[PDB]
Amino acid sequence: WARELGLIRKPASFMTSICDERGQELIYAGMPITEVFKEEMGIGGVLGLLWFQKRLPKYSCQFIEMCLMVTADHGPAVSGAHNTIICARAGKDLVSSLTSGLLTIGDRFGGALDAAAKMFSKAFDSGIIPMEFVNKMKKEGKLIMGIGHRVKSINNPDMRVQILKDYVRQHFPATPLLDYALEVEKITTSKKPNLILNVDGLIGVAFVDMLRNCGSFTREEADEYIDIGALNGIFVLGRSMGFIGHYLDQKRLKQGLYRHPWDDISYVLPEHM
Amino acid sequence: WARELGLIRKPASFMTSICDERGQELIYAGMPITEVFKEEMGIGGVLGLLWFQKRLPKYSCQFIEMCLMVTADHGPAVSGAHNTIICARAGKDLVSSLTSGLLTIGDRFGGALDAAAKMFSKAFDSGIIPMEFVNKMKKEGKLIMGIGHRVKSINNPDMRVQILKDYVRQHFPATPLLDYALEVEKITTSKKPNLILNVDGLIGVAFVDMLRNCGSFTREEADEYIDIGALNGIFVLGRSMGFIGHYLDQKRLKQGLYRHPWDDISYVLPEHM
Amino acid sequence: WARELGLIRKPASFMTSICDERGQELIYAGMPITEVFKEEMGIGGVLGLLWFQKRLPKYSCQFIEMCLMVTADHGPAVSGAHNTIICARAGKDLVSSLTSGLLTIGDRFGGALDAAAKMFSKAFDSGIIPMEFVNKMKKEGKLIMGIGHRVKSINNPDMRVQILKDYVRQHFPATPLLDYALEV
Amino acid sequence: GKSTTLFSRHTKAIVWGMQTRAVQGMLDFDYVCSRDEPSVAAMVYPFTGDHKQKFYWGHKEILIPVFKNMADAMRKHPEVDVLINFASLRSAYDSTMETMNYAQIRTIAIIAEGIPEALTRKLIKKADQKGVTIIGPATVGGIKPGCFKIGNTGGML
Amino acid sequence: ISGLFNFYEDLYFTYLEINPLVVTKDGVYVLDLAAKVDATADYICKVKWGDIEFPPPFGREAYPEEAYIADLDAKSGASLKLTLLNPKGRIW
C-alpha cells in the first residue's frame, strides 16, 4: 500500500533486459506479442529477441530455424541421448530424464560449437595461412575441433553439412570465415580423406559468420556473444528436441529397467586395499 | 569379428524407434534429412518427427511452433526463469544454468499444461454438461485447471489466447474439445469476470485437439500420449528458449552473486534442539 | 553360451577400479563389507575407499567426517539452498529439488575448495616467502580464493576453523601447507 | 655397428602411435609363438597422457602403458631395442630423427608410405653414422616366426 | 650453379638436367631442362607449386571411365589404375 501510493524506497536486483511480462501484453525484448505474430518472426525471431535482443533479418531467422533443425538428435548411441534413454528407462518423468540427458553437453560431446568457434575465430583474426595454422596446432597437440567424420568423407558429402552450406552459398552474403574454414577444409583434407569439417564445427563457424558478418553487431557485441557462450545454446536447444523425442519413445515402447551386463565391464580393482 | 561374419548372437537393449543415425543419412522417423529440408517442414515438423514420429501437416507444425512461441519466456519473476537467473548469476556455464532452471517444470509451476489437458479430456469423454461439470468441481473441490488470469479479463482479452484462438478458429478443422472448453469458458466467466481460459490451459486443450482431433492418432495412441506426458514437454521446450535468453542476458549484463538478503526469510527454528 | 564355455573374446568398456559388486559379498576397493564394518570405519573410511580407493588412517577418517559435518547448510540465503527451496516450493519431489540445488556448486558459490587448493599448491610448490607471495598475487589482481569473511574477522574467530585446527593440532603429523597458509 | 641378430625371443619394442589393431595382432603373435613376455613394452602417442591399455595374453588380460615421453619410456624400460613407427609422412622424419639419439633403439621399422626421398636420404645417412637399421618406407613390416612380428604383416591370426 | 643447388634443395628435386647451356656475350641461356620433383613433400611446396597438372609421358589418350574413377581417387582415398595394354584383348 505504501508503494501503491509511493513513499518508502526499494533498490531492485535481477536486472533482466528482456521480456516485460507486466502490462497489457507479453512484451518480448522490445516487441509486443501481437507484433511478434504480425511481423511474423518465427522462433528464430524470438531467439534473436530472447538470446541477443536484436531483430535478425529474414535470411538469418531462416538459417537459425534450419540450424535448429540440423542440431537435433544424432541418434541414441551418443552420450547424452544414451543418458536420456537410461533415465527415461528408469521411468522417472519427462523433465528429470531430459535434465539428466542435457547434463552431458560439455567439452567432449557437443561443445565443438563453442570451441570450434573460439579457435577458428582466434586463428582467422590473428591471421595465419591455414597451411601454417594447422602446423601451429600440430606443434601443440589439441586436434582442430570440429573436423572429422567416420563415414561420409568428401563427395559422399554429409548433406546436412551441405544443406546448411548451400544455404550459406545461396541466401547468404559474405562468408570469409567459412571461406577461410573451407580453405582449412581444403588443407586438412590433404592429411586425411575423411577428416571433413564437422556439423558441430560448421554450426559454430557459420554462426560466427552470421554474428559478425551480418548487421546489428559491432565487434564488441559480437565477441561478447562468443565469449559468453551463446553458441552452446544452439546445440543444447536443438538436442533437447531429440532428447524429449527419445523420452517419449522410451515410454511408448514400454521398456523396463536396464542393467548393463557384467561381461562388458572388466573390473580392474586393486589387489587388497 | 565373429559378429562381422555373423556367427554368435546377441540380444540388444535400447529398442529406440527414432532417428536412424547409421548409414548414409540421418534418417528420421521414415524420411531422409534431405527430404526434411526439401519438403520444408520447420522445427514443428521435426518435432512431429521426433516426439510423435509422424508427419504432422503444415498448419499443425506452425501451431506447434506458435505454441513454443507463446510458451516461451513469460517474465523473470516466475519460478523456472528465477532458478535460471540464480544459476546464471552464480556464473556456472550455459548448460547447468539452463538445466537447473528447467528442472522445476513440475506440477505447481508449468504443470497446468498436462493437468488442464487430462482434466478437460476426462470431463469431455465421460460427458457431463459444463453447467454440471463446474458444479462437479464444486462438490469435490479441485478448481478447473487452465482457466483464470490475474489481470487481463474480458473486454480486455488475453491477446495471446486470442492469437492462438484465431489460429485455431481459422487454420484448424474439426475442433470439438476447444468448442467444449469455450463453452466452459463462457460458464466460468459467469462467476468472476476474469476467469478466462489460460494460455496454460489453451495450449493443453487445443493440443489435445491437435492430437485426438487431427489425424495420425487412434485413440489408444492419442490418449497414450496424454497419459505419458507429451504435453509437459511443449512447455519445457518453449520455456527453455526463454531460459537461454535469460542466461545470456544475465551474463551480458555482468552481475555478481545474488544473495537474497536476510529480511525476506524469517527464521523460525526450534528453541533448543 | 559361447562365453560361458569361453571361446569368442570380448573387449570391455567401463574400467571402474572400485566396488566389486558380484560374488558373495560387497567388496569395496579391496575390502569386504563385513571387514569395513568390522574394522570400524565410518563414512570417512568408505570415502577413502570409494573416492581414493585407499584405506585412510583413522584420524583422517574422523577429519573427513568432520569436514562433511561442517560443509552442511550455511543458511537458506545462499544460492544453492535458495534454488533448492525454489524447486521444492514448486512441489517437485526430493531428487529433482536436490538436483537443481546442487546444480550450482561451481566457481562463484562453493568452488573455493578446489580453487583454494590449486592456488595454494601452485604457490607453495613454486615456493615464495609469504611476504613476497602476497605481493606476487598483488601484481596480478585475481584475489586469493579462500580468504575473507564478511563479519567474523579477528578477536572474533570463525570457531569452525578452530576445532578443525585443534584436530589437526592433535591427531595429525606433519602439516606444512597449513603452516604456509597460516603464515599467509 | 649394424647387428646381425635383429630379433629374438627376448626382443622388446615400443610401437609409436595409436595402433590397437596392429599391436593386438602382435601380442596375439607373442601368445601363439609360445613366448614368455609380450613383444611390446610401451606405446608412444603424443596426443594422449600416460595410461594403460588392456590386452589379451590368451584369455588373461594385461596392461601396457602408453607413455607420452620416450625418455620416460626409456627410464622405465631400458630393455627395448626396436621401435615401430606408425607416424605419417609429415611427422616420421621428426619422429625418426628424434628416435635415433636414444642409444638402446637398435633397429627401426618405419611403416609409413611416402617419407620424401631427400628426407629419407637424410634418414639413411644418419642411420649410417649412428649404426641403426632402417626397414623403412612403403613397407608392411617384418616377421620372424617364433620371435617377433612387426605391426600388421601377415594380417589376422 | 650455386643458387641452383639451393634451387635443387629448397624445391626438393631429384633430377634436373640442362643440355645445353648456350651462353654468349649477351649472357647465359638454358635450352633444355629435365626435372623429377618429390610430391610427397607437398606440405612443403604446394605453397610454391600451385595449380599443377602433371603431364603424362607422351602416350595415347586417356579414357573417360578411368578419368571418372580417377576423379573418384581425387574425390576419395583409393588407389586406382586402369590403363589398357591393348583394348581389344580378352584378358581383363
Sign of CA dihedral A35, A37, A39, A45: positive
- Residue A43 and residue B16: Cβ atoms within 8 Å? no
Which residues contact residue B263 at a Cβ distance below 8 angstroms, ignoring those fewer than 6 apart? none
Angle value at C-alpha E64, between E61 and E69, nearest 5 degrees: 120
In sequence order, the β-bridge partners of residue D64 are D53
- Residue whose entry in the numeric block shows the C-alpha cell 507429451: B230
- Residue B104 and residue C91: Cβ atoms within 8 Å? no
| Residue E20, preceding peptide bond in cis (omega within 30° of 0) | yes
Residue A34: CB atoms within 10 Å:
14
Q: Which helix (H) or strand (E) holds B194?
A: none
User: Using an 8 Å Cβ cutoff, are B210 and B113 in contact?
Assistant: no
Q: What is the dihedral of CA A44, A49, A53, A55, to 10 degrees?
A: 70
- Residue whose entry in the numeric block shows the C-alpha cell 497419459: B227
User: Using an 8 Å Cβ cutoff, are D86 and D21 in contact?
Assistant: no
Residues of E in contact with D117 (CB under 8 A): 14, 38, 40
- Residue B69 and residue A36: Cβ atoms within 8 Å? yes
The DSSP letter of residue E21 is E
User: Using an 8 Å Cβ cutoff, are B146 and B197 in contact?
Assistant: yes
- Give the largest CA-CA distance in chain D: 46
SS3 of chain D: helix, strand, coil, percent, to 5 = 25, 25, 45
Question: How far is CA C128 from its chain centroid?
Answer: 27
Print the SS3 string covering A3-67.
HHHCCCCCCCCCCCCCCCCCCCCCECCCCEHHHHHHHCCCHHHHHHHHHHCCCCCCCHHHHHHHH
Binding site listing of E: 32, 73, 76, 78
Which residues contact residue A238 at a Cβ distance below 8 angstroms, ignoring those fewer than 6 apart? A67, A68, A69, A70, A71, A72
Binding site listing of E for ATP: 32
- Residue whose entry in the numeric block shows the C-alpha cell 568390522: C38
Sign of CA dihedral A165, A169, A170, A175: positive
Q: Which residues does a gap of C–N over 2.5 Å follow in chain A?
A: none
User: Using an 8 Å Cβ cutoff, are B200 and B113 in contact?
Assistant: yes
**A166 closest CA partner among A66, A45, A251:** A66
Binding site listing of E for Mg(2+): 73, 76, 78
Residue D68: CB atoms within 10 Å:
14
Closest residue to B2, CB basis, from C8, C106, C107: C8
The span from the CA of B69 to the CA of B238, in Å, is 7
Which residues contact residue D43 at a Cβ distance below 8 angstroms, ignoring those fewer than 6 apart? D14, D15, D16, D17, D18, D19, D23, D53, D64, D65, D66, D67
- Residue D116 and residue E40: Cβ atoms within 8 Å? yes
Assess whether chains C and E touch, using the rule of 3 or more C-beta pairs within 8 angstroms: no
Show the DSSP H helices in chain B as ranges: 33-38, 43-47, 58-70, 79-89, 94-102, 112-125, 130-136, 161-168, 176-191, 199-213, 222-228, 232-252
Residue E16, SS3 per DSSP: strand
Query: Taking the CA of residue A151 as centre, how many other CA atoms within 13 Å lie in the half-sphere pointing to its CB?
Result: 7
What are the distances in angstroms from CA D157 to CA C4, C6, D28, D43, D149?
23, 18, 7, 22, 12
- Residue E75 and residue A190: Cβ atoms within 8 Å? no
The span from the CA of B44 to the CA of B50, in Å, is 10
Burial state string for C72-85 with b = 16 or more CB within 10 A and e = fewer than 16: eeeeebbbbbbbbb
* Minimum Cα–Cα distance from C97: chain A residue: A96
Q: Does C10 touch chain D (CB under 8 A)?
A: no
**B77 closest CA partner among C86, A98, A50:** C86
Probe site for chain B from A28, A43, A263 (most B CB atoms < 10 A) = A43
Q: Which three cell numbers stand for residue B256?
A: 555478481
The span from the CA of B26 to the CA of D134, in Å, is 47
Residue D107, SS3 per DSSP: strand
Residue D96: CB atoms within 10 Å:
26
Burial state string for B92-108 with b = 16 or more CB within 10 A and e = fewer than 16: bbbbbbbbbbbbbbbee
Strand arrangement of the beta sheet that strand D60-67 belongs to: D51-57, D60-67, D40-44, D12-16, D80-85, D107-110, D133-134
Which residues contact residue C79 at a Cβ distance below 8 angstroms, ignoring those fewer than 6 apart? B86, B87, B89, B90, B257, B258, B259, C104, C108, C109
User: Using an 8 Å Cβ cutoff, are B108 and C91 in contact?
Assistant: yes
The span from the CA of B74 to the CA of A26, in Å, is 7
The 8 Å CB, 24+ separation contacts for B153-158 are B153/B193, B153/B194, B153/B196, B154/B189, B154/B193, B154/B194, B154/B196, B156/A24, B157/B196, B158/B196, B158/B197, B158/B198, B158/B199
In sequence order, the β-bridge partners of residue D110 are D85
Position C51, amino acid: W
User: Using an 8 Å Cβ cutoff, are B211 and B226 in contact?
Assistant: yes
**A42 closest CA partner among B41, E41, B99:** B41
User: Using an 8 Å Cβ cutoff, are A19 and B245 in contact?
Assistant: yes
CA-based radius of gyration for chain C: 22
Residues of A (244-273) whose Cβ lies below 8 Å from C: 262-273
**A146 closest CA partner among A211, A203, A77, A88:** A203
